Structures are given as structure tokens and as C-alpha cells.
């Protein structure tokens, strides 16, 4: 909704910044095992609820 | 920039060097969003830790003078009192735990365990 509280909007800010893909220079490190960001969330498939 | 070279500096000279590092870090933050160069992006972490060094010497100097001012006083600020453990701070003092009643002081003086040996 347009009528947001500060805590909810701040909560949506953190979840929006975490939705980035993994930078490709991480995959070139020594003991790298991460192929891709497995915690990606889509707005239509997984709802936050909070 | 070293903390050992800041110990002799006055508090006015430390504050003058503090704002010089703050105006430098702000210009590096401007260069970060305006493209800039990698030579200035690597300086961001350097100036950030230089501000931390100057502020640490300032905080450590005033905290030392506060402990020297409240040295040997009955009531000290809570940040100057020792923080060991909430349970430890509520124990009896070294003098209190060593206090014995006058009746026990006589039983310890007269009937203390002697040093002895038995032949067989």
C-alpha cells in the first residue's frame, strides 16, 4: 500500500538491496563454492509476508 | 599517520587534524559517485582509519584524565568503575571477607591447628 510505516518501508529497503546477484569476481576467489545467489526472491513467486 | 605521534599533540591540534581528515573523506565520497579513479577509491579506507586513529587518541586521552581526576574518590562515574561481572561487583570487599568476629579471633589465636608429626 502507499500508506507505509517507517519500519515497514525500512524493512522493504533491506529486502530490496539483498535481491542483487552475486558479483562475478567472487567466483574467482581461492575457495569459492558459490555458483549463484541462491537467496534471490521474486515479488510474484515468494511473498515477504512481514 | 600514527597514534604514537598523536600522544604529544594538544587537543586543539588533534581537532584541527580531525576536520582536515573529514573534509578529505567527504571529497573522496564525492569522487566515488562522480566516477573518479581507483587511486581515490582506495584512499577512502585510508582516511576512514585515520579518523578512527585520531578519535581514539582523543577519547583515550580524556578518559585517562577522568580516571586521574576521580582517582581515590569514594563516588566515581559508572564508566570509570571496574566492570568485571555483575556477580563479582556484588561480593564482599577484600576487607569485609577478611573480617572476623572477636569471638572467632580468640579461637583462631589459641586453638589453631599446630604443626606436628607422628612416629608410627
Amino acid at each position: 500500500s502507499s500508506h507505509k510505516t517507517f519500519k515497514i518501508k525500512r524493512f522493504l529497503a533491506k529486502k530490496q538491496k539483498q535481491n542483487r546477484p552475486i558479483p562475478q569476481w567472487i567466483r574467482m576467489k581461492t575457495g569459492n563454492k558459490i555458483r549463484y545467489n541462491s537467496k534471490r526472491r521474486h515479488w510474484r513467486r515468494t511473498k515477504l509476508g512481514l | 599517520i600514527k597514534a604514537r605521534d598523536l600522544r604529544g599533540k594538544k587537543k586543539e591540534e588533534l581537532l584541527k587534524q580531525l576536520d582536515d581528515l573529514k573534509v578529505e573523506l567527504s571529497q573522496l565520497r564525492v569522487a566515488k559517485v562522480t566516477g573518479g579513479a581507483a587511486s581515490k577509491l582506495s584512499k577512502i579506507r585510508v582516511v576512514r582509519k585515520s579518523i578512527a586513529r585520531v578519535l581514539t587518541v582523543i577519547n583515550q586521552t580524556q578518559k585517562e584524565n577522568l580516571r586521574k581526576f576521580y582517582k581515590g574518590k569514594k563516588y566515581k562515574p559508572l564508566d570509570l568503575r571496574p566492570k568485571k561481572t555483575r556477580a563479582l561487583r556484588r561480593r564482599l570487599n577484600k576487607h569485609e571477607e577478611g573480617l572476623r568476629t572477636k569471638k572467632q579471633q580468640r579461637k583462631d589465636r589459641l586453638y589453631s591447628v599446630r604443626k606436628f608429626a607422628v612416629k608410627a
Partner: protein
């Protein structure tokens, strides 16, 4: 009906975020969190759920201060002194 048509009439959040446990179990009308028992002075924990206890017990989080007491205990909680300088 009781099924699909009834699920379309769900647009009123019952629970919200809690200020104590940060979970979404704070009942709005009851003003009471069903997870940590907020705003009761004591946290809601029960022995009939061992899995729920080990999800929010000491050690499951960050321990900003208990990890320091564990380090200070190995030295006897020494304060007011400094290492010998060079």
C-alpha cells in the same frame, strides 16, 4: 464458498513484527506476541518444544557481549592495566 472464494477475502494482517523477538507473531488486537510473549516481562519458552527452544536460545544469535566475557575469563577479568610497552 468455504474454499477458493473465501481465500480472496483475506486482506487484514492479524500479526505484525515484534519489537522484542523480531518475528511476525505480534497479534494486533491482543497486543501480544505469540512467539516471545511480548509485552510480558519474561520470554515465552516451553519445554514441550525442544526445537523451538534451540532456535532463539543463547548462542543462536550474535552474543555481542558473551563472546567477550568468554575471552575476558581466560585472563581473570583484568582491567585498569595495560601490556608492557616496547
Amino acid at each position: 464458498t468455504k474454499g477458493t472464494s473465501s481465500f480472496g477475502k483475506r486482506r487484514n494482517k492479524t500479526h505484525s513484527l515484534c519489537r522484542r523477538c523480531g518475528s511476525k507473531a505480534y497479534h494486533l488486537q491482543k497486543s501480544t506476541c505469540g512467539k516471545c510473549g511480548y509485552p510480558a516481562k519474561r520470554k515465552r519458552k516451553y519445554n514441550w518444544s525442544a526445537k523451538a527452544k534451540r532456535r532463539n536460545t543463547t548462542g543462536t544469535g550474535r552474543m555481542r557481549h558473551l563472546k567477550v566475557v568468554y575471552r575476558r575469563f581466560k585472563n581473570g577479568f583484568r582491567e585498569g592495566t595495560t601490556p608492557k610497552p616496547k
